[PDB]
Each structure stands twice: as C-alpha cells, then as structure tokens.
A paper describes a structure:
We report a 3.1 Å cryo-electron microscopy (cryo-EM) structure of τA, which constitutes the most conserved part of TFIIIC. We collected cryo-EM data of a sample containing τA, TFIIIB, and a DNA fragment comprising the A-box and the TFIIIB-binding promoter elements of the His_tH(GUG)E2 gene. However, TFIIIB and DNA had dissociated from τA during sample preparation and are not visible in the EM density. The cryo-EM map allowed us to build an atomic model of τA with excellent refinement statistics, but also revealed density for two molecules of the detergent CHAPSO, which was added before plunge-freezing to prevent adsorption to the air–water interface, bound to τA. Interestingly, our cryo-EM map reveals a molecule of the detergent CHAPSO bound to the right arm of τ131, which is also predicted to bind TFIIIB, and it is therefore possible that addition of CHAPSO competed with TFIIIB for binding to τ131 and thereby contributed to dissociation of TFIIIB from τA. The convex surface of the N-terminal τ131 TPR array binds the τ55 HPD and the triple β-barrel formed by the τ55–τ95 dimerization domains. Despite only being present in hemiascomycetes and being absent in other eukaryotes, the τ55 HPD is well-ordered and an integral part of the τA structure, rather than being flexibly attached to the τA core. Our structure shows that the τ55 active site is accessible in τA, arguing that TFIIIC can directly modify substrates and the activity might be coupled to its function as a TF. The acidic plug contains a helix that is rich in negatively charged residues and is embedded in the positively charged DBD.
Author numbering:
A (entry chain B): 25 to 236, 263 to 509, 566 to 592, 1006 to 1027
B (entry chain C): 3 to 211, 227 to 260, 290 to 360, 418 to 433
C (entry chain A): 130 to 306, 341 to 573, 612 to 639, 645 to 1025
Amino acid sequence: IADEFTLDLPRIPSLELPLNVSTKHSSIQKAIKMCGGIEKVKEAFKEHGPIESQHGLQLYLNDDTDSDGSKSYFNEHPVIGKRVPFRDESVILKVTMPKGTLSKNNNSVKDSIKSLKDSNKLRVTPVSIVDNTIKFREMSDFQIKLDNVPSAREFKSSFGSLEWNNFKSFVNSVPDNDSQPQENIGNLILDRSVKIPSTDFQLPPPPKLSMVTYIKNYQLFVHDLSDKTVIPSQAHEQVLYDFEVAKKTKVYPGTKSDSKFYESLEECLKILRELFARRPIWVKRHLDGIVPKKIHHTMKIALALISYRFTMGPWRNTYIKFGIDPRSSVEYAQYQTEYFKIERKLLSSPIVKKNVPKPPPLVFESDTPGGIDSRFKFDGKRIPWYLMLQIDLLIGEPNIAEVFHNVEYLDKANELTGWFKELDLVKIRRIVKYELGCMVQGNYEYNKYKLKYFKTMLFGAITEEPDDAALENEEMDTDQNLKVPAXXXXXXXXXXXXXXXXXXXXXX
Amino acid sequence: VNTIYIARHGYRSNWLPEGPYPDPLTGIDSDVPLAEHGVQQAKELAHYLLSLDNQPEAAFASPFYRCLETVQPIAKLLEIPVYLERGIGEWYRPDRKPVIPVPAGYEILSKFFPGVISQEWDSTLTPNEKGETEQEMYMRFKKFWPLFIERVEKEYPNVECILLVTHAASKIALGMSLLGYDNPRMSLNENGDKIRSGSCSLDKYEILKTYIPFSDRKWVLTMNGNTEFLSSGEEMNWNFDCVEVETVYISVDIPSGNYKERTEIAKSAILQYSGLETDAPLFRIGNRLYEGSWERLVGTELAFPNAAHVHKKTEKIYRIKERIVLSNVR
Amino acid sequence: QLLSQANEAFVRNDLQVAERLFNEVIKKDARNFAAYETLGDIYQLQGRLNDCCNSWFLAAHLNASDWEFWKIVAILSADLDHVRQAIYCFSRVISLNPMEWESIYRRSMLYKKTGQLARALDGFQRLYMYNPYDANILRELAILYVDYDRIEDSIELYMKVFNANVERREAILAALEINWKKIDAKYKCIPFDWSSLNILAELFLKLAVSEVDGIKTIKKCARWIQRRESQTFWDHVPDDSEFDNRRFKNSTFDSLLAAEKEKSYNIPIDIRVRLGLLRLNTDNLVEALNHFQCLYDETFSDVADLYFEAATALTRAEKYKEAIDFFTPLLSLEEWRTTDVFKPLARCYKEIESYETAKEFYELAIKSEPDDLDIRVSLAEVYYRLNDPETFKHMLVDVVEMRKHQVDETDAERERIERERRITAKVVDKYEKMKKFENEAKQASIWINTVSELVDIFSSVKNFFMKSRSRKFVGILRRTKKFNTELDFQIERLSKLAEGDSVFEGPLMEERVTLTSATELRGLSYEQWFELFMELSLVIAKYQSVEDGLSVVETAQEVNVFFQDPERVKMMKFVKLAIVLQMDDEEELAENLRGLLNQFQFNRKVLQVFMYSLCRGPSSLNILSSTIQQKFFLRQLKAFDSCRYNTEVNGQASITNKEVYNPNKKSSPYLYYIYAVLLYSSRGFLSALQYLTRLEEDIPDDPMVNLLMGLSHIHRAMQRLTAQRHFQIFHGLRYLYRYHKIRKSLYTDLEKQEADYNLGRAFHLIGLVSIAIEYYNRVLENYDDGKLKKHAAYNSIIIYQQSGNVELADHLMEKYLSI
C-alpha cells in the first residue's frame, strides 16, 4: 500500500511517567532526577525475577535540595513503579515536519499531519521498538511533615547535609548512657526555636503506612499491675442494670423475646459460677469445651459479670473471678500464663504442618467430662491444640514437675516472672521449647543430657511470643460487640455510629 | 545473500572549518583521514548495528584510508572480517586537475590496520584509472553486483548479510542499480525523494518476498539513510544535483486481548503506513493488517535508546505525548 | 539420447575401472545426477573423498528436493573440514523441512566454528524448545548465552531444570499410594546431579552481583540432592553452618529425627571452593576460609588447581597472609613452580614485611621472564626496605635503561631528623594555608587536594595499620594526577628515594619511624588529624563519589590510635552511618545500625537515628520487616523490663547502661514504637496493637500513635472475613478523626495541611472515594504550601481516570504536576 520500513531495530526501554514533562532538556533531566538519576533508571530495566526480587523506581515528586545540601522533605514516601510483565511491544515513529507547525496547530501531531497532507517535507520513519516499560500504577502513601520537629531538624542538618561542623555537635550530644529513656526527648535537644508541644514525643514515621441484632458488651480490663492499682470486686454499673431488669422482664434489653438470650444466660451463668469456685482462673478456650453450643453466644456476657482479665502481667489474658487478687497469695502461682509460638516462616516444611495438630473449633465437647481436655495439656507428646497454657498444665511432664516441686517462691509478686524466680521459670520454658521443637520434627526421643542440664542449670525454632491463634482470639474477646442469634451525607448516615458518625458530621 | 547494508565513510578532516591540517598517511592524493568527530560517528554506527538482530557477517570496504577507519571499530565490535573491494571506489570525473588518485593495496594499509583486514578477497573489478563519466559509472555498478554476489555466494555460501562501507556517489549508484533504475539521479518512487547519503549514513536492502540467481531477484529499500543513532544528525549529504525542521515522536501500541501473553515483532518484519492524515490510519506490520485510533496519553513516556539491548560476542531521550492503538482487521 | 544407452552399459561396474567413460557422460550431458552420484560413489570406494564430496555437491543441485541427499553430502563435507560448503548443504535441508533436528545441531555447531554465533543461538532455542529434555542441547545452549554475557538467562535455564526435577520427586513421594509410565509421561526432565550444580556455581561467579542470593540457591540444590529438601530452616541461618561440623551446635538440627542426621552433609570440593569465592566477593573472609580449610583433606594432586584459584582470589582481595598458606604447598610440585605462583607469592611476603623471604621469590621470577619489570621495580623496592642502598642504585640503572630501551620502539640517625624537620614544616604550613582560606564545589576540590596531601603523610607511617593500606584508598591519594603510569610513578618515585628528598606523593612509600611522643606525630596532635579523616570522609561523600569517602573512614577505623581511644570510635561509627545512607544498599546499613544499638542501649538519640534513617523506601522496609530486627528489639525490650521490675540479683548479661532511672517504672514509648513499626511493616496488625495500645494509655495526645492505631484497625479489618470488619473500621476512624483534631488545633498551618491529605488518603483506602476528593480539594484550595498538593493531585487523577473524568485530570496535571 505504501513505502516499506524495516523493523529490525533497537529494542529499547520506556518510562511512562504520570507527569507532564515538556520538550525542554532541563525539564526531562529533572524528571530523571526524581527517579534517582539516569544511572538508577537503567538498573531498574536490567532487573529480573518476581516482585521484590525486583524493587522498581522511586518517584520523588518534591525532589529538591536546600542550600545545605540536605533533601528538602527527606521523608517523602515515594511512588513505586515496577516493570509491567508481558508487555505488548510497540514501535515509535519519528515524525518530521517544518519548524513552527506545532505552535500554530494546538501543539498536536494528529492535526499537524492533517495540515500539510500533500507536502514533501513530512518524513515519518520508525526509529526503535519498545519492549520494556516502567509505569506507576500504585498510589501515593500517607505523608508526614517533620519541618517543626526539632529532632528532624538536627538529623537533617547533620546526617543529610553531611556538614561536619554540626555533625560533631550531634555526636557529642548523644549520652553514652542515657539516664531517662522513659521521658520525652525535648530535654536532650538544644535547638529550642520551634517549641514542639510537650505531648508530641517526636515519634518518627515508618517507611510504608499503606500496606494493601447486636449487643454492646462491657467487660472490665485492668491495664496496669502497679502496687497501687485496684482490682474489680463488683461487676459493672451498666451490665448489672441491663441484667437486673433482665430478671424481672425476661428480655435482656437489646434483644427480642424470641431469642431466649436470658434463658440461655442463666443456664450458662450457673455453670461458670461452679467452675470459678473450683478453678478461679481460666482461659476462655478451655471453657469452649464445657458450655454447649446452644448457650455459647451468651458466655462472653456472663464472664463480664463474673470475671475480669488483665491485659498484662504474669496472669496475662486470663479470666479471673471478682475479689481475687493473684498477688495476694502464692497459691495463684500455678495458674500464671505462659505463651509459645511455632515459627512457620522458619519451619516452612511439610514435616511440620502435619505434626502440629489443627486448632479447636469455636466450640466443642470435652473428652474430659466437664473440664479441660487432655489435648490442651502438655505431657511430652502430642503438641497441644492451643499453645498459651498455664503452669498448672505443664506439670504432667516429669522433668517439668521435679523442677516445679523444687522451686523457691518469691515473698512478693514480681510484675514479671510472678511468684517464681526468673531462673526456675526459664528452666521450665527452655524445656518446653526443646520438647516442642523435637515433636514437630517427629522425634519424641529426647536426649537426657541436654534435658538434664536444664534442671541443674544456674544461669530458635520455638518462640514464646503469643501465637497468632491466640491474638485472633483476644480480639474476639475484647470486641465489645457480639451477635445475638445462636455520598458525603449518605455515607455519614449509613454508618450511624455514636462516634464515627459524630465527628464525621463535624467535618462537613 | 538476502540482506545488504551500505554506509558512508564519515566526517573527513578537510570539512573542518579550520581547514585540512592532516596529511594523507598513505601518501596517495586526497586519501585524507577522518576527524575525531568522524571517529565518534563510526563508533555510534557500531553500537547501533550491535543492537540489531541481523547484524552483518562480512564487511567489504573500499581501499581508501577513511573507509577503513570507519569499519575498523565495526569489525572489532562485531568480530567480523574486513575485505577490500576496489570496485566501490569513488567516482572521479576525467577533469580532476591535480591527479585522478588510485588508492593503496593491502601491504600499505595492513601496516596502519594490523590484523583487521583479510587478504583472501581479490577485487572483482577496478575503476577506470583515467577516470569515468557518469554513464560509465552506473554501468560499472551494473556489472559489480552480479560478479560480486556470485563471488560471495561461492567463496562464502554461508554469509547471508553483509556491510559495504563506501562513498556517496557509489552509495547512491549501488542502491539504484540494485533496485533496477535506468539512471541514478532520478528519484525513487515519484516524489523527489532521493537516497539520503549523509555522513556515516546507513541503508538497507532486503529481498522482496528455491534459491535463484541474483539478476532474477527483487530488492527493496527499507532504511534510506538512517542517521538517528548519530548524536548530531546528517551533516554533509550529497546527491548528483550537487556536482528549518522539527522532530516529534509517537508510539504505536499493539495491545493483545488475552491474559498475560505478549505480542511480538519477528525481528525481520516490514511496515507500511497509509491514511496517516485522517482519524483511522491503517498499518501493515509483516503479514498482518491493522487500523489505528489516535489517543493522547495523560503524562509522558520517555524512551532511552542508549539503554538498548546489545548482543555482543564477548544522552538523548525521546519525549512521547501521543499514541496510536492498533486493532486487528485482517 | 544415445548416452542413456552407453552409460548404464558402463554401470555394469563390478570392478570400478570404466570411470573414464562416466567422465565423458558428465561432459556430454552434464545434467544426469546418476552420473555424478556413481562417479562420486566410486571415489568413495577408492578413497578419494575430497573428489567424492565435490561430485555429490554438483549432483545435489540437479534434484533439489531429496533432503536425504543434502545431508549425506553435508556430513561428508564437515568431516573434510569444508564447513562453509557444509552449512549451505544443511541450509538446503532446513528449507525443505524445518522439522529436522539433527541438521540444526550440526549446522549450529559449525556456525560456532565459523564465528557467526547469532545464527547458532537461533538454532538452539528452537532445538531446545521442541526438545527441552536433552542435555547436549542444554549444555551447548548455555555456552552461547555466556558468550553474550547473558549469564542471568543461562542460570534460569539450569534452574527451570531444577524446578522440574523437584516437582518430579514431590509427585513420586505423593504417588506412592508405583506407575513409572504415568509419572514419566507427565514429569519428564533432565537429571539434576552434582555436575549441573558445579556448572551452576561457575555462573554466579561470572555474574558477580548476586553473591548472597546465589549462595542460598547452591545450598538448596545441595540439600535437595542428599534427600534433605525438608530441612528448609537452613535457608535462614546466615553462614554455612550446614556442610560443616558447626551444624551440631544448632538448636533445630539437634531436634531432628535420629534418622535425618546420618544423611550426607558433604559437598564435593569443586563446588565448596566456589562457595568460598562467593563469600569472599561478599567481603566475608571467615566463611571463605572455612570452605578453603576443607581443601586440605583431599589428596594434594587432585585439587592443585583449587589451591591456586583460591589463593589467587585472596591475593586479589588484599588478603596477603591467608594466601601464602595456599601458594606454598604448590611448591612441592614442579609443574606449578613458575612465575604465576611466585609473583603473586612474592608480593604477599612483601606486604607481610617478610622481605628477606620475598627477595628470593622475586629473584626466581626474573629468571623466567627477564623482559618483565613489574618484578624488577618491586625487587628494587625490597633492597631499600632492607638497609642495603649500595645494591639499590645498581638495580635502578638496570631497570630504567631497560625501559628506555622499550619506549623508543614502543647517617641513619641524621638521615631522618633532617627529613622530619622539613616534613613537619610542610605539613604544618599546608595546614595553616588550609585554615586561613576555607562556588562551593571548586573550593572543595582545591581543599581535598591540600588535605589528601596531608593524609598521605599520616597513613604512610606503617606503625598504625596491621595491614597495608587499601588500593581503593591510595587510589584516592593518587588522584592528584601528576602521575603518568602506576609503574612509571614508582620509577620517578624511586629515583628520588636514593639519597635526596623532594615533593612527591607517598613520602618514602611507607616507613616505620620512632614516634618519640604521644599527642604529636608531626606538628599536628592526633585530634587535628582525626578531624581531617572525618571531615575528608564527608566532603568526598558530598561532592565527589560517595564510595570513596567510605574508604577514608573504614581506613580510620584501623589506625591503632583511634579505636584504642573511646570518643573516637564513637564518631567513626556515626560518620560511617551517614555515608552508608547514601550507598543505597540494604545489608550494610543494618550492619551499622545494629552496631550502634548494641553499644548505645536504651538511648533515645540513637533510636531516632534508627528510624529517621529508615524513613522511606523499600530498602528500609525490608530491614524493619526482617525477622532479625524483630528478635533484636524484643531482646532490648525484655531487657528494659528487667532493669525496672527485677528485685533480684540478675540485672546483667544484657544490660550495658547501669544509669537508667525510673522510680515510677514507666515504660519507654520509643521501644514500644520502634517495635510496633516492625510488626506493622511485617503485616502484623494484631501484635502492633498489643504495643500501640500501651502507648495510647501513656501518650494519648501524640498524633503518630493515633494514626498507626487508626490504620492498624483499618488494615486488620480488611484481613477479617466476618461482620466485625465494619465495627473495626469505625473503631479506626475515631483514632484518625482525633489525629485530625490534634494537628488542626495544636500545630501550625503546615501540619494542618497534612491532616486533610492523610484523612482523604484513608477514605481512598477503604473505597469511599467521593469523600476522599473532598479532603483533597482542601489541600489544593485552602492552603498555600504546595509540597503536598502534588501528592493530592496525584491521587485525585487516579480517581478521575477510573471515573473517566479525564477532562479534569488534564487540568490538575498541567497545574500541579507540571514541571
């Protein structure tokens, strides 16, 4: 149909910016400077593998230097642009025309060619092929301004500028031994020009902030285990009100008469009252094996008017009867909490995911009638279903018993390690870390010399953080909402929250 | 032999404004070397060829000293042989006042170019030492192609692509004679579009779609003087009549309608355009036919030709603001 | 034709003697292939092969469809070294059938012999594509990518073999519930064994940029073999504890079955040595030796090419003490007793100050190649390091005359007090001329020169470094540019070493001198020198190459006067950090930060340097998100709780500061914050709330706490798959709405702009896009500072592209994102 052109040409990279780069050579080199420079744009095209085996470019929209050489807005959280996989190759054509035709025709090539339709001066030739492109499909992240934070002013002027005259003043300012880590850092700074508020604490930001038929419960939580803190001895002002009327009218306000929530509550409530008399400290995951399916939905409400739970300490995340302060007697030492975690990220093998038994249901029937199962308990075999477990359960194992039966208790309860020494407890913890790591691998043999050294000690695969199965069950317990059954204005009205809808209206 | 490249020598020294200070190193009249700018051209022609697929497999330079300097880095980079071919020397009219020069041989040029030149190849034909008018020039290039190729296709049956480094007057007669015109000074098709013979230009002659003798083959011109690899454009074009402009770039996308499978170009394809004036142009790319739609893009697309994939046997950015999206109509 | 009668009357052959008449028919007719075939055939019987291939070549063009005939004459030609004639004959075959895979192999192998590899490589991809399961095609295809330096494409050729070998074994072990015919038809592959792992190790060395990620790939392929693919936990330990006797000291290997221990943990030495060369380019000397110390157990003669390739690497990496242990055994063999052993061995004995031992090994190397003078100039240098100048001058005349012959064709006490006197006047005045004065980039280069002309006087004293100065560091001092060549420099240097002294770089090249005083070396006083190294390190890092200033500080860390003194090793650890921020490389920044946090325990200035250093980028996210950091701060966060809570004797074994003072026993809001960032950055939004909620009890009016809390719920909610998801986003917004109420009310009108954006950015996250633009139109309209406007116009554009409102996305880009 017309003249021919070869396409055996350089196969080159491209960079589809979201910016309106002009034709000037000062405008282009600035857009390369945002993306790290021409030397860092090229090594972004010369990188292979799936995502995060390759990390792309860093578009810094506000790239500019202050007079001191520091990066103005040195915390920009850039826009990341990565190579698009399986790109459809595209040719690029050099359109050539007389000087001044773009200016008189809206600076468009679509119309310029139409203006000089039969001129001999139009020359249109392919010059290369584009097989590779970086483009910025992701979106910009949350941004933080640190211009009036005086610590950033001290960093920026020392580590950013690399000026030695004020670098030296910084390093002579860091105390080799800091005497007050617990306090605000406004006392260690010598700028005193900006007057940060006293309650800001100058916490620096992280590198990536964007990472992509009801009842209100009122259970009590205890946030601090100081020697001053008070423990609840009576339930709560509102639940007793919601529950005292529930005795006379049998509806439990917030529910329909047809749900039988209250009749389910009492048949659960008399169960727990027997249990806390027998064992005053509990985990809810042990109570799931006792209360039937029909009255489990109302257990999260009966615990609130029978029990409280610490958010920290040795008795962390256990339900405790009212009036019972575990720091008052040593008999509450065998009930204190110990956590264990299996690191799948380091034990990523098929040998493990068959030996670790699968978690419990939300609710089940106990093999032990009316009590804790033998499957929560640790006895040197059969990894338990649930790895946060009290000292009262470990003692079935012989070696942990003869450690337990030789302990010396503290006279005053420590805010961590409880009534036990730090020694006699790591002596218990290190054994369990050794035994679980073995039976995950299917060993069950247990060399006695390593297992004997612990018992006579004087002083990682398994780790003592809370397992994710536990954290997922803590949130479902701290959530103040539960199910009873066994567009600026529209979005503002759709929520209808007591707080979320309040402030949302104020800001509009 | 299915493919031919032809290229001009480069930027001489006498073209400098301060004048011809260097002397012919070989001693022959008008055998002037290149300037340092002409050497930077020849390296840029090497890194361009080295970015292609059907790179040349043999180089047939003229014996003149500056055509050897042009092909020296092309030989080192691509690791190819360089043969002298006297039949592609300059066209000297019989009215040269000082002398009609005849260039040097192997023994003189091998001293300046050690190891690069290969002496297997005796010249097929020698220009008339008395000089030759224009009608004698073109028939000489009618004789050259049948005798040259047939001595390539039997001493080197495996070579399918070659490079010729020659001069302007030859480069324009080598093209027209190959394409089969009657005289060289006419235009290619009808539109006054001669062969662009700029300094260190590059042409391309592919065969037009059993093996057949040369004179029955049909060739087409597919580059016509590419100077885009040069950092300075075409400097000193020449055509037989001698005896403002702006550039903008546009992309032509070829999108697939499938999940995670990429279109490709066969590295030997051919492109023809038409209807570029109107809203719906039609492009052929190889055997397939397309129909386009103009679509400006928000933002820009910056392409880096200096970031090309060089093969290698061991400054300029293209600002794009408009695009064409092609759809299958075949 | 009558010849049709005459010829077959002569095809009665039976003794092959009438060939003269066949010679006539090919002259008379000259078109019958029957004549050329037989005339060529009888040449095969008599053995005139060069005449056989000629006739069959003339015969082939007559009947050019019989691609069986082009081949039998092609292979004959390749046997008779007529490659260019053979490639044509193969090329005629492939045109007749493109599905013959023996000719493409034989043709492509001849392209290599010819030099046109691009046509060879094109033959192998298709020959590999249609037969991926033959090793000979694999082995030759991987050579050609290496000839193009396309090594990363040759590794993914041997690795996609491995990934097929794996999926075969996983299917066998699972399909035991045997049908070889059913797994072979589905899982067919090239066997991966110790050999293919050996080649694979060679490619990571020739690649030379993915050192540590390539080691981990060699070990996975080494544990897959030996039947240990289940021991995935070795992928995370840093340093080669497996395949050594150090594996018995691991917490997890000691827990394995009694049966998994007896599997083999031994590499063949040809692969082990390559691992040591990977670790050495990683600048990990220690594990390189632990690989090379395994080279002593093998029989000597079987690994002598590895003693040399290991020592040659240690010598090029400036490890002159470790290399001698691997050169000197080779001298027991005579076939290794030449210059390529001596000359790398002799300079090792020179840098180790064993000059009398190196005097021999130079005097031996010259006997093999007297025409070299790299040895003659160095062997001259040794005669000066020894106190024998009489022979030194006679070696200078010999070498300079030897060079002039080549370019044409192309008082020991009084000796140094007289030098100390004039060098102290030089160094003090050049230092005073540097203080009274000082574009701001040409004033630096003139400054760096007159400081590099001082640091060459201090570092060249040799009583301070237990090793020689780095070539990377002397290269920064040789940048004065007065030199011609690295060897010519020595000659114009050594010529003045004779009796006199004058201005030249490298004063006397190095020399141990009696210090005779502390607090002074020259007129400078050891706190005027240290201020130069640190000020030279930063200035070179700011205006000149950043990688050069880092060599100044790594050299100042080994001076025997600086790291001996505290309050100087403190600064070098910070100055080195300030530069490592500008390297843009992940896994040494962390090595510098963990070096500070161990020394400076519980210090608040350092914990901010930790996180201001890590304020942007994925190179910083991969540090925080790493498990190595999550174990560290947990170890520092249990140590802080031990310092405040324990009434016991135990406050040791981690506590480095004995000065902490917290009578009320408050926590540190920093260690809770840094540690929550690690868990946030690890997508651990449950664990972060366990620690951030402890902050909201302590510092509730802090914005950054109420922001992370609001995002930790919004992000955790989108993980959940129940109706509590909605309650948890509304529980997040309340902590974002008070973040808003704080920044708007209690800060000035620049942080007041932040709070609109980050709220609009939150409604984009949860998809309430119509509300997001409302906040974005506030940062564009209601404020003057324009640094957040182009982040808000960036995210507004994305909203409008999706909504097709490109009419308005063009207005924002031209106004704010223009340039």
